[PDB]
Amino acid sequence: VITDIHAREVLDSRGNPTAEAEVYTELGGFGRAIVPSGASTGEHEAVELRDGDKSRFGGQGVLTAVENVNGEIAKAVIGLDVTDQRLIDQTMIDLDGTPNKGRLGANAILSVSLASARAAADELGLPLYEYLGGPNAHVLPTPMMNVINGNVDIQEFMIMPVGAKSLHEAVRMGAETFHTLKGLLQERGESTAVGDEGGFAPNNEEPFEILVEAIQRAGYKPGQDIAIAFDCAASEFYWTSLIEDLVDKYPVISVEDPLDENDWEGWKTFTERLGDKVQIVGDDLFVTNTSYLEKGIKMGVANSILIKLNQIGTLTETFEAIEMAKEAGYTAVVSHRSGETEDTTIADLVVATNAGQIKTGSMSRTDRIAKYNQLMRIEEALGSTAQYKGIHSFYNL
Amino acid sequence: VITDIHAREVLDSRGNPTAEAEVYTELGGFGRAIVPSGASTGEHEAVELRDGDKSRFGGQGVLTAVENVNGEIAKAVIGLDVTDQRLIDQTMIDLDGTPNKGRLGANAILSVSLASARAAADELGLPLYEYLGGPNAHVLPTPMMNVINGGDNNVDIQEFMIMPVGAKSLHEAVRMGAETFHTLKGLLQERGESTAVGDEGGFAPNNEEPFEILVEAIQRAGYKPGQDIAIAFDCAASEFYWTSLIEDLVDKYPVISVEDPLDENDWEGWKTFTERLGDKVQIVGDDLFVTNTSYLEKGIKMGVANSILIKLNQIGTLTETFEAIEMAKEAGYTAVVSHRSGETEDTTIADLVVATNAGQIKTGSMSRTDRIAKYNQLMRIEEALGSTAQYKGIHSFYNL
Ligand SMILES: [Cl-]
Ligand SMILES: [Mg+2]
Ligand SMILES: [Mg+2]
């Protein structure tokens, strides 16, 4: 039984306010969770509640969402069993009463949702991934790391160690390649300062050449050892054949949001042509919402979904999106937001669900690195029972 | 009693390997600590042990330091009482047998040192700052925030910092800093400058200019330069090795602190610098003192500097770090608890700085979780303290 719930305002990796919640149980269980925040939010994402007080953080305060936790949510949830995740989440969903969590705030709700799962794992004496996924939680994710950013139209250029035999090796290959890329950029007189996700933004096809060169320089085989993924996020500058040229030219394994978030017909066309060649990920298209994913499955749109906890607002609804995707033969790529925190929940979440892929940033900034560190702790704990799939994560192909 | 000790190789904020250690106790206490790593390491720092296997992380692995913990250190420390910090640290110091901890590695030793203190706090049911400092741990630090850099441009000085000396709480200090940081960001955006960040979360656009830019950002954020937000800077002069020049910057701008303005081995130069400027500015020894009581003692006797930058991994143990802090205080010197440019998700320095009531912290700009995690922990600590908390701001500077 949950005995107390407390929220506070802390800062994310961009120095912007976000919500942190703590849950206490009768047995002495403790869980603390922090909610990340996007900058390129899709228009159909769950409501992130901001104060709009221009005298605090330019109106980016989350004191209201925090008070919604400390008041209404605390009253509604205290007394529930900490292990009753679905009841806890549905209770908050009903309490809000709006489809997009706009009354209480998705950031208020998710903070409690995650802190509850953590408190439950704590009081059971289980690591988070074991509690969330059960005895067969064992698959470590093949990570796509955002090393080059976009001047440039495409938003994220990623390396993905599909040839690694463990997560540890995947992390080392990524780090070595990142630092090779860093040296490469330094030669060409580019800045080695980093964007929000830890990657570089030097001054659409050029980054593909740069990635291949960096991979080769680090002593790895492009395609076999390290492949390329990218997120167009085309909603920000709103063609299929240009994408397909890139795909056939370069060792690309995944492409995300290659078309606008509301262009359902164009997506279906895209998927028909390229669905056999590459992973096609919907991000702004699906917004971690089962109602949107269901539509795409019926239309044969995409073959993958980017899973973002705060796009939907509860751990339960996130489980439901991941499982719906799996049953449709879609991969579920568990994802960070561009505004991250010291919270590492997504690492445990992706192993718990055996999703097989993660998108949690480049090889710099602790807001990304902490996730990779946790994944390594998880792999160590799993020992011989662990599994890293690499290219075999792509059951959608 | 400590029953188990385990170490592993994890990654820092630059994507470089570092040591993480865990300590388990008989009562079921648990502690986990991670060791930071510097880029501009002073030559007299304790030894950071690296593998040198160029087939792994370009030779930056720390598997040896990790194995040193899992083997030798674990055998020497397991069975010791977890609350016996001084004995635990001395046991490791003697076990290594070398003055610079070059045999086992300072990174191996510090990882266990800090994890022990955490495991002790955990089994006692105490927050870390409470365990480390006792019932009068209550002072939140005035933070100096590295928002502009110069350590690839025409600027020789390494860190350009804002410091909310006019805030009434740490929460306010953090907000003032973040608002100013974001004001600064828009300003660089206006001038066609990049908004990408360096290792510590500050901007690196393309010596006087950063001071003028900082003053402008402070003003645009709606704060008063000097009274509300002052300027501090770290030249790190050693990395590129004058008093009247420095005194021009100090007299021209609302500067409250300057760090390593001279070379790490120029004690005579430092002495005359302090003679000139010691009355109107904080003078911080970083590479000069390397968190080492032997170096600080020499500085104190010669009348060199009036402040020391406190870095745990510069000396290798929590105990020796406590000793540097107390020696500094007793000499009328301030102790600025500090991060390294290579940080982790570990937030020990936040609890350490409150535990010792040091009054100042240097833990980075207002971006990157490697910095922000510390500011978050300080806010958690301030909320916990409640009415018993104290933020000193400009009054942290008892050396002036
Ligand atoms: Cl920086
Ligand atoms: Mg996207
Ligand atoms: Mg320094």
CA angle B249, B254, B260 (to 5 degrees): 55
Nearest to B367 among A15, A369, A380 (CB): A15
- The type of residue at B269 is G
Distance between Cα B232 and ligand 3 center (Å)? 12
Tokens 């102790």 correspond to: B335
Who's near B126: CB < 8 A, 6+ residues apart? none
Asked if A63 contacts A9 with a C-beta cutoff of 8 angstroms, the reply is: yes
CA of B368 to the centre of ligand 1 (A): 9
Q: Do B369 and A366 touch (CB under 8 A)?
A: yes
Instruction: Please provide the size of chain B in residues.
Output: 400
Question: Which residues of chain B does A380 touch, with a Cβ-Cβ cutoff of 8 Å?
Answer: 8
Give resolution in angstroms.
Answer: 2.1
What gap in Å lies between CA B89 and CA B95, rounded to an integer? 10
Tell me the technique behind this structure.
X-ray
- How is A145-191 classified by DSSP, letter by letter? EEEEE------EEEEE-TT-SSHHHHHHHHHHHHHHHHHHHHHTT--
A359 known ligand binder? yes
Say if residue A338 carries a ligand binding annotation: yes
Most B CBs within 10 A among A30, A181, A366, A378, hence the mutation to make, goes to: A366
Asked if the Cβ–Cβ distance from A341 to B57 is below 8 Å, we say no
**A31: β partners:** A23
Q: To the nearest whole angstrom, how far is the Cα of A196 from the nearest Cα of chain B? A: 8
Per-domain boundaries in chain B: 1-125, 126-400
Q: What's the CA gap between A372 and A387, in Å, rounded?
A: 16
In angstroms, rounded to a whole number, what is the distance separating the alpha carbons of residues B199 and A12?
17
Superfamily of domain A1-125: Enolase-like, N-terminal domain (3.30.390.10)
Contact B11 A340 (CB under 8 A): no
Three-state secondary-structure class, residue B33? strand
For A340, name the nearest residue in chain B, comparing CA atoms only.
B369
Phi, psi of B210 (to 5 degrees): -65, -35
Catalytic residue among A101, A308, A326, A371: A308
In 10 A of CB B240, how many CB atoms?
Answer: 12
Question: At A147, which amino acid appears?
Answer: V
- How much distance in Å is there from the Cα of B199 to the middle of ligand 1? 5
Q: What is the number of CB-based contacts under 8 A between chain A and chain B?
A: 118
A371 is an active site residue: no
- Whole-number Å distance, alpha carbon B203 to ligand 1 midpoint, is 6
Phi, psi of B102 (to 5 degrees): -80, -10
Q: Which of A20, A176, A366 sits opposite B368 (nearest CB)?
A: A366
Do A363 and B15 lie within an 8 Å CB cutoff?
yes
C-alpha to C-alpha distances, A256 to A303, B93, B274, nearest whole angstrom: 10, 53, 58
Verify whether residue B168 is a known catalytic residue. no
Cα A297-A299-A304 angle, rounded to 5 deg:
40
**How far is CA A335 from each of CA A188, A352, B264, rounded to the nearest angstrom?**
32, 14, 45
| 8 Å CB contact of B179 and A376 | no
- Residue from A35, A168, A185, A364 to probe the interface with B (highest B Cβ count within 10 Å): A364
Which tokens is B325 given?
């802090």
User: Helix, strand, or coil here: A71?
Assistant: helix
Exactly one of A197, A317, A340, A379 is catalytic; name it. A197
Structure tokens at A302: 């995409």
B379: nearest CB among A10, A12, A342: A10
Place of tokens 């990142």: A178
CB B309 within 8 A of CB B338: yes
Q: What distance in Å separates residue B127's CA from the closest CA in chain A?
A: 14
The span from the CA of B224 to the CA of B217, in Å, is 10
Q: What span, in angstroms and rounded, lies between the C-alpha atoms of B296 and B285? A: 9
Q: Which CATH architecture best describes the domain B126-400?
A: Alpha-Beta Barrel (3.20)
For residue A248, the CA-to-ligand 2 centroid distance in Å is: 22
Strands A357-359 and A387-388: unpaired
Are A87 and A80 a contacting pair, CB within 8 Å? yes
Residue type for position B113: S
Contacts of B241 (CB under 8 A, 6+ apart): B263, B266
Whether the Cβ atoms of residue A34 and residue A342 lie closer than 8 Å to each other: yes
CATH no. for A126-397? 3.20.20.120
Indicate if the alpha-carbon torsion angle A86, A89, A93, A99 is positive or negative: negative
State whether A176 and B344 contact (CB < 8 Å). Answer: no
Mapped onto helix, strand or coil, the DSSP state of residue A318 is: helix
